[PDB]
Curated annotation (Swiss-Prot), chain A:
It comes from Homo sapiens. Activated by the chemical integrated stress response (ISR) inhibitor ISRIB which stimulates guanine nucleotide exchange factor activity for both phosphorylated and unphosphorylated eIF2. Keywords: Acetylation, Cytoplasm, Disease variant, Initiation factor, Leukodystrophy, Phosphoprotein, Protein biosynthesis. This is Translation initiation factor eIF2B subunit delta. Component of the translation initiation factor 2B (eIF2B) complex which is a heterodecamer of two sets of five different subunits: alpha, beta, gamma, delta and epsilon. Subunits alpha, beta and delta comprise a regulatory subcomplex and subunits epsilon and gamma comprise a catalytic subcomplex. Within the complex, the hexameric regulatory complex resides at the center, with the two heterodimeric catalytic subcomplexes bound on opposite sides.
Swiss-Prot record, chain B:
This is Translation initiation factor eIF2B subunit epsilon. The keyword Ion transport does not apply. One of its GO terms (biological process) is positive regulation of translational initiation. GO terms for cellular component: cytoplasm; cytosol; eukaryotic translation initiation factor 2B complex; nucleus. Activated by the chemical integrated stress response (ISR) inhibitor ISRIB which stimulates guanine nucleotide exchange factor activity for both phosphorylated and unphosphorylated eIF2. The chain holds residues 41 to 459 of 721 of the full protein.
From Swiss-Prot, chain C:
The gene is EIF2B1. One of its GO terms (biological process) is response to peptide hormone. The modification N6-acetyllysine is found at residue 32. The keyword Heme does not apply. The lineage of its organism: Eukaryota, Metazoa, Chordata, Craniata, Vertebrata. It comes from Homo sapiens (Human). Keywords: Acetylation, Cytoplasm, Disease variant, Initiation factor, Leukodystrophy, Protein biosynthesis. Belongs to the eIF-2B alpha/beta/delta subunits family. This is Translation initiation factor eIF2B subunit alpha.
From Swiss-Prot, chain D:
This is Translation initiation factor eIF2B subunit beta. Its main location: cytoplasm. The keyword Lipid metabolism does not apply. The gene is EIF2B2. Keywords: Cytoplasm, Disease variant, Initiation factor, Leukodystrophy, Protein biosynthesis.
Length: 346, 414, 266, 318
């Protein structure tokens, strides 16, 4: 842990970016696989921060690890591999908390490994595991976005003013595919500090030819009156109908409801978790607190904030939105309500 | 010591040619408002107490426009002084004449009459004086640069420069343009003497604002073939030191050519030069008041907007301009006393005062100056400039980059 | 086309037969007369054109889904099973009406009429308030048919639904089509009554059959297709203003219809 | 003489380009001093002519900056004072100038003591082991909070302002006194506002129907407060009350350069991207719960009477 945490957020880990976990490790990593080591280093340094990008990188690293995995004698691999992959996941979590996508993916991989019988050969098992990972990715990530792109194309109209927030690999694709089909609309990109990841969507839209706008989230109440729809992306859909997404989503949906604007949500079926949550206090993630430091004017005001023992710096990442503010959810199965997540989980 | 500046209200370079024949460069209406007004407002806002306005080309119009302006009033704190002369041929001659007259005393700023900026120079000026007071008579000039992207529309190749300065203490060691050249050369003296902290910078926008010193005019009198500022810096770097000051939270740019003109206009209308905006009316004029509304749409008095027309983006309508029915204007600047027809599409068009556009005209990315006129069924292409008092017959389609002027040799005559 | 002829035949022969039931009957009758799927889609569009209601479209979609030797058997069984949907809904909904309660009903509907006819048969007493439904004077027909059963009906004004909302213990209205999110497509004067009922915590009940489930998800009054509205004739009511649903499949919540539709896959 | 003219011109020019006095109290003091100056040494022989001159000067000052709704309030207050002092004698013109300066000095003393009068009501609204959420940087709210820390222990949450992160300075100045402060972004105003109990914020001005003009993001804060049914206290002195109503509010928000929202070094996308940066926003009265002033706490539904007592209905448009 680094720095002093908040009283209400003292049950969560607060790591740092400068403090690397590879200091107390061998350059040729013995206990940990080099692939997983570099993956955790990238996660800690922020090289891979996308919800789906993180899962894809994790699965590719796991494929690489399996490619060079030798089953010892005196034991089967169907269990040795599961027992060996656990410390890797623990190290990855120590580097950066895992996401719901990564959790579901490792669960599916463990289930598939357990489904392998000792009756089969090692090479056949490894090849089947690799092919299974490949086709699972292609289905739940690649093919799971083409159906959502043609389902949301119906709800997009000419002259619409769609409002997006943050960065999402699915929202940008939906908009870029709807623009090329014949729709002529304009997008409003909302961003928040300190990540400022909305600029990614802004650039991806400008390069596509869609008229786009950019403004910070505090001014969301000023532009919403002219907004017709609010298309948002999330990281996970809880079993209680709620939605887990970036911290600046719940208040955005609240202001949209206050302005009488229909809110939408687009998520893949593989992000349908089984747990539940009521607020952003029981399970969240506190990133490095020094990200709030900003060069405003002539000097920084939080340059030595740790000298003040009473001052705390909260850097929440995720948040939980109630089902009372979500109208429609878009998936590969079709348009379903916000209170139908358990039905899809069935 | 009161801060004093020198304003060169004449660019002996002729890039707006043919347009600079009937009317000076520095009085071309950018946003219903002259450029010298922007420059004078910047100088008056940064702390300048006295200015010396030098004009050679069409100086009578410049002065007789300034004498009605608000900076020449007895209630202005920046007293301006117009010095007109027919001998001036380049900036070097102007500095030579200042040295001959002994007008300047202390650190003075050297800016052109077509510079639009909201930069504050108190910080840079302090740095300059402190630096000169640690090394007596060492630092001679401080050039202000605005860090930008090499992709930005405002960065034209004609003004694009590359610098190699020291990072320990901001100091110019090499300066050269990049107009029509692909691989840059940097001599070895830079690493020969000093500059352990040396770095090449290509992300800079030359604001043409420089805090000069009397020694600058002295050296300009010594070397007779210094015709501009760029050559002063090159000839001083072959041999005194020249330093910089970089800004990141302020705007500054010089209108050097036509492509540069349409770049500052979008920024000024889009409030990139705050507080300097059309809504502010920084001239104290009666015929330039407007009201800013959503989407940066500015409407003046007596706009006479017709039913059906749609203003979609950052447009600026003048006072007295008349708009018809079922029109479509966007990213377009309309002057005062303009009068449009019906079914008129304007996309990134700059219409000055006294223009009339007939019905059925489609104009895109082209500039119409004073007293211009186009008949019905006329379509103008991008960069299709019309100068003063031309009339385009009906059913004509002008090619891209076409230039029409009433002077025979200027361009394709009327 | 003889399709419209048979449709009008079934509609005129049986006055209380629903539109969707008659459409499905005509479709099954013409099925006796691959290639077949397009033939059917064509029949469904002409029928849909003659009567622009959501019930007919829902019934046609459900029939075609049933179509994807054995089809005649399954269709006869389906028709006989859907015939008793009215009684199945009545036997389940008439128990929610207690003595001394005031009812607030919308324009005429055969299902609510059957529910009330079954409730009064169980030795019960209540009061009813029917809206005139200005678009077409069918609320007066409902009040007449109710007073014919010896019940103290009272016709109210179309703009007085908010004035008598405090004097109503519950609200029971029909539905032309149940959308995927639990909402309902009902008469144009239904969205305003549900809003008042919610503003005064009044149980807003909805009565509909199973053949009225449609794969639609309107976000507001604009997302509704214009072919159903045509002074619009119908409106969409959000599920947050509905308390429960009485269907032949049993008493359902606003969310169970989405589960049923997902199970059916359109 | 013309020294008054040049002082007025300097004031108008300072109000034109940027902000002058940092604190609103200093702005009101300077405006009242300038009004007293133009009143004391001038050629005037009646009351209506002085009213017209004051109206012209106030119109000029308001045209200089429409979002600075503090000079107009002082102009209207001076107009009301003149009208009352004229009616007290007419219902004349012998020594009106002598008591006008006395009334202006009394108003100046009130403006000086308003801060201490507002800060004295801190314990009446804060209890032990309480959590308070604020936004931006307000000297009145800072005093209100630090006046209770000397006798109570609470947890102060501060939400920064994304365009100009001024909440950091407030959090630092508060933690300098041991108040257990916290810093966070504007996006985390709703997800975190589930354990908060009270909200105390400031404002730029108070409208006629109870609404007010606050910094950007205050609307979302009020929405969250109303969604969680938490009280929303507004610590604002009397000079921040404007008689104008919520007209369609085009000049309501102050739009500044997009450099704060999106930097100039982004690239070529700035030519085809419209960036807006509104500084202020409109907060309806229904989302407000109380108004703490130097004359005691009041409800939003009673501000009309305070206005009627402060300004004359004829000087509402100026």
């Amino acid at each position: 842990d680094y720095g002093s945490k908040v009283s209400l957020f003292s049950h969560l880990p607060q790591y740092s970016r400068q403090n690397s976990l590879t200091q107390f490790m061998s350059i040729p990593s013995s206990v940990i696989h080099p692939a997983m080591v570099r993956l955790g280093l990238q996660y800690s340094q922020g090289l891979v921060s996308g919800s789906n990008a993180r899962c894809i990188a994790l699965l590719r690293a796991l494929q690489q690890v399996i490619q060079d995995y030798t089953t010892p004698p005196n034991e089967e691999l169907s269990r040795d591999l599961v027992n060996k992959l656990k410390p890797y996941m623990s190290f990855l979590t120590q580097c950066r908390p895992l996401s719901a996508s990564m959790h579901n993916a490792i669960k599916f991989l463990n289930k598939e490994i357990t489904s392998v019988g000792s009756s089969k050969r090692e090479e056949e098992a490894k090849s089947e595991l690799r092919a299974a990972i490949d086709r699972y990715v292609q289905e739940k990530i690649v093919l799971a976005a083409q159906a959502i792109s043609r389902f949301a194309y119906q709800k997009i109209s000419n002259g619409d003013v769609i409002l997006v927030y943050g960065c999402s690999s699915l929202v940008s694709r939906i908009l870029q595919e709807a623009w090329t089909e014949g729709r002529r609309f304009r997008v409003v990109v909302v961003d928040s500090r300190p990540w400022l990841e909305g600029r990614h969507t802004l650039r991806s839209l400008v390069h596509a030819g869609v008229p786009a706008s950019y403004l910070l989230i505090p001014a969301a109440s000023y532009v919403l009156p002219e907004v017709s729809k609010v298309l948002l992306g999330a990281h996970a859909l809880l079993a209680n109908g709620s939605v887990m997404s970036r911290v600046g989503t719940a208040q955005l949906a609240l202001v949209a409801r206050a302005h009488n604007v229909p809110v939408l949500v687009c998520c893949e079926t593989y992000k349908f978790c089984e747990r539940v949550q009521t607020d952003a206090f029981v399970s969240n993630e506190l990133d490095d607190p020094d990200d709030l430091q900003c060069k405003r004017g002539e000097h920084v005001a939080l340059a030595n904030w740790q000298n003040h023992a009473s001052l705390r710096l909260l850097n929440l990442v995720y948040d939980v939105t109630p089902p009372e503010l979500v109208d429609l959810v878009i998936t590969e199965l079709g348009m379903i309500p916000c209170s139908s997540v358990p039905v899809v989980l069935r | 010591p009161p801060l004093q500046a020198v304003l060169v209200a004449d660019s002996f370079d002729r890039r707006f040619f043919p347009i600079s024949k009937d009317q000076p460069r520095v009085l071309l209406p950018l946003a219903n408002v002259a450029l010298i007004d922007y420059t004078l407002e910047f100088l008056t806002a940064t702390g300048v107490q006295e200015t010396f306005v030098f004009c050679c080309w069409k100086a009578a119009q410049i002065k007789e426009h300034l004498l009605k302006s608000k900076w020449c009033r007895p209630t202005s704190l920046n007293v301006v002084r117009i010095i007109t002369s027919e001998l001036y041929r380049s900036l070097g001659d102007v500095l030579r004449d200042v040295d001959a007259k002994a007008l300047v005393r202390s650190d003075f700023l050297l800016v052109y009459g077509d510079v639009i900026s909201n930069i504050n120079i108190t910080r840079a000026l302090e740095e300059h004086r402190l630096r000169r007071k640690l090394e007596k008579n060492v630092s001679v000039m401080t050039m202000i640069f605005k860090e930008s992207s090499p992709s930005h529309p405002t960065r034209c190749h004609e003004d694009n420069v590359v610098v190699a300065v020291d990072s320990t203490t901001n100091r110019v060691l090499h300066f050269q343009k990049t107009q029509g050249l692909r691989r840059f050369a940097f001599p070895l003296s830079l690493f020969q003497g000093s500059s352990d902290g040396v770095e090449v910078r290509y992300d800079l926008l030359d604001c043409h604002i420089s805090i000069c010193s009397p020694q600058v005019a002295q050296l300009f009198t010594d070397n007779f073939d210094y015709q501009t500022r760029d050559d002063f810096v090159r000839g001083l770097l072959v041999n005194n030191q020249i330093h910089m000051h970089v800004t990141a939270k302020e705007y500054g740019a010089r209108v050097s050519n036509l492509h540069m003109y349409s770049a500052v206009c979008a920024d000024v209308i889009r409030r990139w030069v705050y507080p300097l905006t059309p809504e502010a009316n920084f001239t104290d004029s009666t015929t330039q008041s407007c009201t800013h509304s959503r989407h940066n749409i500015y409407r003046g008095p007596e706009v006479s907007l017709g039913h059906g027309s749609i203003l979609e983006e950052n447009v600026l309508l003048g006072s007295g301009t008349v708009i018809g029915s079922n029109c479509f204007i966007t990213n377009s600047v309309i002057g005062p006393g303009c009068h449009i027809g019906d079914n008129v599409v304007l996309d990134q068009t700059y219409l000055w005062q006294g223009v009339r556009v007939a019905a059925g005209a489609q104009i895109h990315q082209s500039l119409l100056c004073d007293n211009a006129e186009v008949k019905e069924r006329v379509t103008l292409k991008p960069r299709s400039v019309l100068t003063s008092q031309v009339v385009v017959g009906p059913n004509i389609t002008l090619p891209e980059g076409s230039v029409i002027s009433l002077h025979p040799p200027d361009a394709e005559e009327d | 086309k003889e399709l419209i002829e048979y449709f009008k035949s079934q509609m005129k022969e049986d006055p209380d037969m629903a539109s969707a039931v008659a459409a499905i009957r005509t479709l099954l009758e013409f099925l006796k007369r691959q290639g077949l799927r397009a033939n059917l889609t064509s029949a469904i569009e002409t029928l849909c054109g003659v009567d622009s209601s959501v019930a007919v479209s829902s019934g046609g979609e459900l029939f075609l889904r049933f179509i994807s030797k054995i089809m005649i058997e399954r269709g006869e069984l389906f028709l006989r099973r859907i015939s008793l949907s009215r009684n199945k809904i009545a036997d389940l909904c008439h128990t929610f009406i207690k003595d001394g309660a005031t009812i607030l009903t919308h324009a005429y509907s055969r299902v609510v009429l059957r529910v009330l006819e079954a409730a009064v048969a169980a030795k019960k007493r209540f009061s009813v308030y029917v809206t005139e439904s200005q678009p077409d004077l069918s609320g007066k027909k409902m009040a007449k048919a109710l007073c014919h059963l010896n019940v103290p009906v009272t016709v109210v004004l179309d703009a007085a639904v908010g004035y008598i909302m405090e004097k109503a213990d519950l609200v029971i209205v029909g539905a032309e089509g149940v959308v995927e999110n639990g909402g309902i497509i009902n008469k144009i004067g239904t969205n305003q009554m549900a809003v008042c009922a919610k503003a005064q915590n009044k149980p807003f009940y909805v009565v509909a059959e199973s053949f009225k489930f449609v794969r639609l998800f309107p976000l507001n009054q604009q997302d509704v297709p214009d072919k159903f509205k045509y002074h619009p004739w119908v409106d969409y009511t959000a599920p947050s203003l509905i308390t429960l649903l009485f269907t032949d499949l049993g008493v359902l919540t606003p969310s169970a219809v989405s589960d049923e539709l997902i199970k059916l896959y359109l | 003489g013309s020294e008054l003219s040049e002082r007025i011109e300097s004031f108008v020019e300072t109000l034109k380009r940027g902000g002058g006095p940092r604190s609103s109290e200093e702005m009101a003091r300077e405006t009242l001093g300038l009004l007293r100056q133009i009143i004391t040494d001038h050629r005037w022989s009646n009351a209506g002519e002085l009213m017209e001159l004051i109206r012209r000067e106030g119109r000029r000052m308001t045209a200089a900056q429409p979002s600075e709704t503090t000079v107009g309030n002082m102009v209207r207050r001076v107009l009301k004072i003149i009208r009352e002092e004229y009616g007290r004698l007419h219902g004349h013109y012998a020594q009106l100038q002598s008591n006008i300066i006395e009334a202006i000095n009394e108003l100046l003393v009130e403006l000086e003591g308003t801060m201490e009068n507002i800060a004295a009501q801190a314990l009446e609204h804060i209890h032990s082991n309480e959590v308070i959420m604020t936004i931006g940087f307000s000297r009145t709210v800072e005093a209100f909070l630090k006046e209770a820390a000397r006798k109570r222990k609470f947890h102060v949450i501060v939400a920064e302002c994304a365009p100009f992160c001024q909440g950091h300075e407030m959090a630092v100045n508060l933690s300098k006194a041991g108040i257990e402060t916290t810093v966070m972004t504007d996006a985390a105003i709703f997800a975190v506002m589930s354990r908060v109990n009270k909200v105390i914020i400031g404002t730029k001005t108070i409208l006629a129907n109870g609404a007010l003009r606050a910094v950007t993001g205050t609307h979302t804060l009020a929405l969250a407060a109303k969604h969680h049914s938490t009280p929303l206290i507004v610590c604002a002195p009397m000079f921040k009350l404007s008689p104008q109503f919520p007209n369609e509010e085009d000049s309501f928000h102050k739009f500044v350069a997009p450099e704060e929202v999106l930097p100039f070094t982004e690239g070529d996308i700035l030519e085809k991207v419209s960036v807006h940066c509104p500084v202020f926003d409109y907060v309806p009265p229904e989302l407000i719960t109380l108004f703490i002033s130097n004359i005691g706490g009041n409800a939003p539904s009673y501000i009309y009477r305070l206005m009627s007592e402060l300004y004359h209905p004829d000087d509402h448009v100026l």
